[PDB]
Amino acid sequence: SGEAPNQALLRILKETEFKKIKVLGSGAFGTVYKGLWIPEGEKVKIPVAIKELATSPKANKEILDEAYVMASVDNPHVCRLLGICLTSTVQLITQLMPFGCLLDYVREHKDNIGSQYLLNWCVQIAKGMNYLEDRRLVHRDLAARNVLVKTPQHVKITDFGLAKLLGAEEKEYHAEGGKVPIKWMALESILHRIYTHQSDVWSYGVTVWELMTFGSKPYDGIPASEISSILEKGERLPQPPICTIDVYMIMVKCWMIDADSRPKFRELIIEFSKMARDPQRYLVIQGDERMHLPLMDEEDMDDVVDADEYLI
Numbered sequence: 001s002g003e004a005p006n007q008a009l010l011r012i013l014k015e016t017e018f019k020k021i022k023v024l025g026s027g028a029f030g031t032v033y034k035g036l037w038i039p040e041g042e043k044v045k046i047p048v049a050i051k052e053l054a055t056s057p058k059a060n061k062e063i064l065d066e067a068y069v070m071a072s073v074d075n076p077h078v079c080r081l082l083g084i085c086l087t088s089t090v091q092l093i094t095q096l097m098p099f100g101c102l103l104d105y106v107r108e109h110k111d112n113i114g115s116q117y118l119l120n121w122c123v124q125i126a127k128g129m130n131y132l133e134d135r136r137l138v139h140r141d142l143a144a145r146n147v148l149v150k151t152p153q154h155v156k157i158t159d160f161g162l163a164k165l166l167g168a169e170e171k172e173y174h175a176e177g178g179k180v181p182i183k184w185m186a187l188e189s190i191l192h193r194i195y196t197h198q199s200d201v202w203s204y205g206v207t208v209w210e211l212m213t214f215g216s217k218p219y220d221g222i223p224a225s226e227i228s229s230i231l232e233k234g235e236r237l238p239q240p241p242i243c244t245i246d247v248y249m250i251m252v253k254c255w256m257i258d259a260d261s262r263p264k265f266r267e268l269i270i271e272f273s274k275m276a277r278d279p280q281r282y283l284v285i286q287g288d289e290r291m292h293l294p295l296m297d298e299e300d301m302d303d304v305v306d307a308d309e310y311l312i
């Protein structure tokens with residue numbers, strides 16, 4: 001056995017077991033609805049998100065590839081599949097993240113978000129991404145829009161549409177034609193269509209930047225065709241006003257031209273955990289102590305990290 005068998009269970013749900021309530025979104029992805037799921041016999045009601053896309057055989061092929069990935073994942077900072085409903089068009093059933101996506105959250109709560117929240121989101125996105133590195137998955141679409149908010153204290157990574165499982169020997173995913181978001185893409189991915197976990201580290205840099213700028217558009221007012229050139233010259237995204245050189249040097253390292261020089265997601269967990277232990281030393285936000293949402297024993301404990309944050 002070259003690779004290990006995937007013994008994950010695919011749960012199939014009855015259309016009668018769940019009730020749609022509202023539409024949450026529409027667009028390229030298709031449409032996402034909010035619902036309740038009463039599993040038959042169990043005196044339990046589960047708040048769910050039902051995702052779909054008229055029927056097309058080319059469309060159902062892609063939604064079932066996504067369900068494959070989502071049913072294989074199991075981490076507190078990764079969105080998992082609750083089940084699939086086999087109707088006219090295939091429906092994806094996942095957990096409802098009541099606070100919506102993280103991009104719209106940072107925009108809405110711009111003046112109530114404190115350093116402690118921002119740095120913790122950074123630790124959590126890294127933990128979820130380190131899980132994907134462990135499972136040999138290359139997300140290929142990490143952005144603040146693809147991070148959902150369960151509570152302001154707990155975030156999870158979503159959208160496994162472009163995700164690719166790498167073989168125990170395979171170390172790069174050579175893509176072909178297809179619409180990829182350029183502003184979040186690593187330089188190697190724009191020039192050679194190569195995707196590694198290190199190319200995901202790049203996209204993590206831009207996500208951290210989106211959070212720190214309270215939801216700004218990377219390279220705002222710059223056409224897609226230019227981004228390849230701008231990055232080749234040595235230009236990167238600017239230093240966000242709330243950022244200390246310490247946080248910005250982490251971002252800048254995620255954008256190294258040499259992929260192997262960029263930090264590993266487990267190094268990003270360690271680095272953002274230390275910063276989350278004194279958040280005011282790393283993010284300068286006016287009114288940090290009033291901003292709300294719904295300590296040692298020995299020598300210098302600056303480099304102190306809890307075992308839960310020290311992965312390998």
Ligand SMILES: COc1cc(N2CCC(N3CCN(C)CC3)CC2)ccc1Nc1ncc(Cl)c(Nc2ccccc2P(C)(C)=O)n1
Pocket residue numbers: 024025026029032034049094095096097098099100101104145146147148158159
């Ligand atoms: C209560 O549930 C939600 C509400 C909102 N929004 C709806 C617009 C609302 N707006 C904000 C702007 N404001 C001016 C006016 C009110 C803010 C809250 C967003 C998301 C979820 N939950 C949720 N669970 C699971 C999924 Cl999986 C999902 N995903 C999802 C939901 C919608 C579209 C796309 C996705 P994706 C990224 C493509 O999976 N989304």
